[PDB]
Design a protein around this nucleic acid. Structure first.
Ligand SMILES: Nc1ncnc2c1ncn2[C@@H]1O[C@H](COP(=O)(O)OP(=O)(O)OP(O)(O)=S)[C@@H](O)[C@H]1O
Ligand SMILES: [Mg+2]
Lengths: 325, 187, 127
DNA sequence: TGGTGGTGGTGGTGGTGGTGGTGGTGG
């Protein structure tokens, strides 16, 4: 009705007058609500995530067992953003980072910020301080199982500190959720695994640090090790599969695989040939790979080596594989 | 801690005033008043110390607390409500008792628990077949003897007029609430 | 705490020193008439009312008794727990079990003696 | 020309950590 139109217009004017310009608007007119993503370093994982990478202005969580490869994945993520001109920070609560290996995966070690906090509260305070600044595009927290509360630091071993870090984490998410989206920053939490005692039925594994992050995250990934990569009789790498156990920007529950080669990171060209086969752009003549009517090699290693040595075919295959999926 | 409480108990008598938090922390061997504050708060939460406006109001136990009900027959609603206490020693019972429950029904007559009695429970989650336990099955509690095998658990009666209750772990949730240790009757 | 009465020999009260098992601090006010002391029993004879072997039965000591009450008494100077039914000059102590039978011994030959009522039951035995 | 005299409390926050090996059989 005509009365309702003006009655609503006056209310919108009042709200915009009190809380500022833009406190309310049609959901189809807010461009700050659009989603933007950045690559994760492995093509299969970007296809799996649906949107094409990890969202900015959000929270992402990565958890898995030991020696699984969730620090290499995060350094791979950092490396790509710097190649695009984005500033980065890394917070090592675990006190276990090796500078040279970061330099060797691809990271520009002279521009990456680094902090080693003495208490979890200090780590989260630094996170918020950089989020408010508006000048840092990616923050990484090495582990949540290491964010010790101050009261636990000054005490003795054997003291009871029932449920204190969980309360701290809830407060932290509550305070960071808005600053992250306003400043358009991506905050990545790495987490460990522990066991639930006395469970009667179901999977007993869980994560540390409470329930709040399970709600406040937009994406959660599970990363695990499968097998060994043999250059000969000696091991030269690992086999990895990641799962999308949560997703708020695309359909959930997909998968992704790849290889981690010690000292180099993910081998992109190994992924490329696998994706090409699955997509009929590469021909597997039994034990022999083939391309466009010519013979390639006797295995995956030969195929990827040949592709690496031949940039033309690599570009041709990549710029087509990207289009379909 | 007990030693911290003793420090106040004798320091107050020797000097006439309680020691400062800094003094307690220094005696504890750490450079922070938080060390003394944590123990003072823990004692206060224990009901031994009173606090007002950040300072001790004084240095001024009711026994087992009756918490809720439990059903010998069909499962009964689980809802904690501490209605009262009873003055009885934990040391009486085999593993130390933690709280009391009120029993309704007659499905454990042979062993010796009946309507309206108080049952002492010892809190735990480690138990094995053949013991007397308390279980929660989708927000409802029962007391029975356990027999676990595979994906199904049998909760047996101890009276020939009642038949066993069986729950499948793939459909209903099952959490063990403790272990029974005795009975008190006053009716 | 309250004294506990274990095995009882003839010729002495229940609370005689050698009958004292120990002290267990149980508040006496929990029970309807104030509980005075406790007394271990072999309660196979009062199963149906919920008394078992090894449990403890609280007693408020008094010689006054009426019909229908559960009383600790002695016959032949021997302790027993049973309910009381009075005919007049004759009185019988009765069980609450499926296999036991009454006790109607003659007072002129052996007289009944009361020591207290039974107010409540406490137990700690194996399950 | 000269001042009197104090009312009444409000609301909870958060989960931890797995432990241990049995028993040979047949010409
Ligand atoms: N400095 C290094 N040089 C060579 N290989 C390494 C080096 N650091 C780690 N790796 C290997 O990379 C694989 C995955 O290890 P990382 O990703 O670095 O650590 P993580 O698995 O994420 O967490 P933790 O600390 O092992 S529980 C493993 O096979 C490591 O052996
Ligand atoms: Mg690591």
């Amino acid at each position: 009705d005509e009365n309702k139109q003006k009655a609503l217009a006056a209310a919108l004017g009042q709200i915009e007058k009190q809380f500022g310009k833009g406190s309310i608007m049609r959901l189809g007119e807010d461009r700050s609500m659009d989603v933007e993503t950045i690559s994760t370093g492995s093509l299969s994982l970007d296809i799996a995530l649906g949107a094409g990478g990890l969202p900015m202005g959000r929270i992402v969580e990565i958890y898995g067992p030991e020696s699984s490869g969730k620090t290499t994945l995060t350094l791979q993520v950092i490396a790509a953003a710097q190649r695009e001109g984005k500033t980065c920070a890394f917070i090592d609560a675990e006190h276990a980072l090796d500078p040279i290996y970061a330099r060797k995966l691809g990271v520009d070690i002279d521009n990456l910020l680094c902090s080693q906090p003495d208490t979890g509260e200090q780590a989260l305070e630094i996170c918020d301080a950089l989020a408010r600044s508006g000048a840092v595009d990616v923050i990484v927290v090495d582990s949540v199982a290491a964010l010790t509360p101050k009261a636990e630091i000054e005490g003795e071993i054997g003291d009871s500190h029932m449920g204190l870090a969980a309360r701290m984490m809830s407060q932290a998410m509550r305070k960071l959720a808005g600053n992250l989206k306003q400043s358009n920053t991506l905050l990545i939490f790495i987490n460990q695994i522990r066991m639930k005692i006395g469970v009667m039925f179901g999977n007993p594994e869980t994560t540390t640090g409470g329930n709040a992050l399970k709600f406040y995250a937009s994406v959660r990934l599970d990363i695990r090790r499968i097998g060994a990569v043999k250059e000969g009789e000696n091991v030269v790498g690992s086999e990895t599969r990641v799962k999308v156990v949560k997703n708020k920007i695309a359909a959930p529950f997909k998968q992704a695989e790849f290889q981690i080669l010690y000292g180099e990171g993910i081998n992109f060209y190994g992924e490329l040939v696998d994706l090409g086969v699955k997509e009929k752009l590469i021909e597997k003549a039994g034990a022999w790979y083939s391309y466009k009517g010519e013979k390639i090699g006797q295995g995956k290693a030969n195929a990827t080596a040949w592709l690496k040595d031949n940039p033309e075919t690599a570009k041709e295959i990549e710029k087509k594989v990207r289009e379909l999926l | 801690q007990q030693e911290v409480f003793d420090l106040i108990r004798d320091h107050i008598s020797q000097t006439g005033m309680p020691p400062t938090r800094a003094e307690i922390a220094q005696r504890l061997g750490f450079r922070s008043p938080n060390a003394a504050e944590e123990h003072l708060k823990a004692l206060a939460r224990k009901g031994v110390i009173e606090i007002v406006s950040g300072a001790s109001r004084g240095i001024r136990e009711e026994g087992l607390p009756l918490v809720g009900r439990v059903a010998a027959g069909e499962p009964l609603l689980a809802q904690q409500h501490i209605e009262g206490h009873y003055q009885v020693d934990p040391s009486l019972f085999k593993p130390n008792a933690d709280f009391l429950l009120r029993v309704s029904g007659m499905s454990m007559k042979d062993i010796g628990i009946m309507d309206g009695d108080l049952l002492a429970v010892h809190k735990t989650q480690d138990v094995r077949n053949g013991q007397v336990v308390v279980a929660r099955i989708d927000d409802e509690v029962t007391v029975a003897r356990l027999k676990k095998q595979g994906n199904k658990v049998e909760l047996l009666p101890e009276n020939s007029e009642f038949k066993p209750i069986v729950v499948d772990l793939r459909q209903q949730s099952f959490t063990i609430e403790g272990l029974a240790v005795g009975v008190i009757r006053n009716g």
